[PDB]
């Protein structure tokens, strides 16, 4: 299916990934939405 040898010539495959929003939404050290007070 590939006609060229350089990687650059390949099609824009094509592999999906799971999401990982925690990098941006939960960078906070040692917390969890337990329903527990955020600051205590």
């Amino acid at each position: 299916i590939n006609y060229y040898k350089d990687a650059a010539s390949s099609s824009s495959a094509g592999q999906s990934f799971s999401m990982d929003p925690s990098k941006f939404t939960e960078p906070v050290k040692d917390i969890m939405l337990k329903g527990a007070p955020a600051l205590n």
């Binding site: 350089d6 990687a7 650059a8 010539s9 390949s10 099609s11 824009s12 495959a13 999906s16 990934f17 999401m19 929003p21 941006f24 939404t25 939960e26 960078p27 906070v28 917390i31 969890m32 939405l33 337990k34 329903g35 527990a36 007070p37 955020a38 600051l39």
Partner: protein, 273 residues
């Protein structure tokens, strides 16, 4: 498939997902099931459309140049008269693309270019001509042509592309670094000097692309516009950032108008629906 929502009935508890502290900087995930009763239902969605790859993977016009078929004039350089027209590569020129890229601090990808040429004859030409167009990639440090027919066009080592007007060329260009990712922004200088230029222009050394009408001079002037499109492949990006709100002024700069128009539209009152 996965659930968008999980059935949840009325609660009376000590656990309160609805209260938090944004002061922490966290944006802890919550669901509708935390505020209201809900029915169980499926996502029926993968997010494929929103992948970074699909977002930055659509071709966009990057730059347009104009070159002509014209009898050289002794009094002008072949750049003054557009027999030859060397584009300095920079995806920031046509700002729709620029914004999509500026949304990330560091971006890595292979490029795919598509080059399309169209001719026109505003003069009294007696016939059309499917001119052959040459594009030549000139890496930093490589010779810059002085003449439309200079020795540099031999392209002994420079990648080059030949195509006709009405046709298009397409080719891939691998990530050119030199770093592990392209910088969209650069909070710095080329060196430690008060007068040194500031910003990404410092790092933008992708070279230039020279365009030429290969054909010898006809009996009339022909104008050719060449449009360059770019599509990213195998795209990775890091450190997302807020999109620019204000109009761009110049390439490689984050400058804006001294008295900018506020992007936010106003209303009579905070209470107006």
């Amino acid at each position: 498939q996965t659930l968008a929502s999980i059935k949840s009935d009325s609660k009376h508890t000590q656990k309160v997902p609805s209260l938090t502290a944004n002061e922490t900087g966290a944006t802890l995930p919550t669901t509708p099931s935390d505020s209201v009763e809900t029915r169980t239902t499926l996502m029926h969605y993968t997010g494929s459309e929103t992948t970074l790859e699909n977002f930055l993977g659509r071709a966009a016009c990057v730059h347009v140049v104009e070159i002509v078929n014209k009898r050289p004039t002794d009094t002008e350089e072949h750049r003054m008269q557009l027999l030859f027209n060397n584009w300095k590569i920079n995806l920031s020129s046509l700002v729709q693309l620029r914004r999509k890229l500026e949304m990330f601090t560091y971006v890595r990808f292979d490029s795919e270019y598509t080059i399309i040429a169209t001719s026109s004859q505003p003069n009294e030409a007696k016939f059309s001509s499917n001119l052959t167009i040459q594009a030549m990639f000139i890496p930093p440090g490589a010779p810059n042509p002085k003449k439309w027919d200079d020795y540099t066009w031999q392209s002994a080592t420079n990648p080059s592309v030949f195509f006709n007007v009405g046709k298009s060329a397409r080719f891939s260009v691998p990530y050119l670094g030199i770093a592990s990712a392209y910088n969209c922004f650069y909070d710095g200088y080329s060196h430690d000097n008060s007068t040194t230029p500031y910003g990404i222009n410092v790092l933008n050394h992708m070279g230039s692309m020279a365009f030429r009408v290969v054909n010898e001079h006809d009996n009339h002037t022909t104008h050719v516009k060449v449009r360059v499109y770019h599509r990213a492949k195998h795209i990775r990006a890091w450190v997302p950032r807020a999109p620019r709100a204000l109009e761009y002024l110049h390439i490689g700069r984050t400058n804006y108008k001294q008295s900018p128009q506020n992007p936010i539209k106003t209303r009579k009152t905070i209470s107006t629906y």
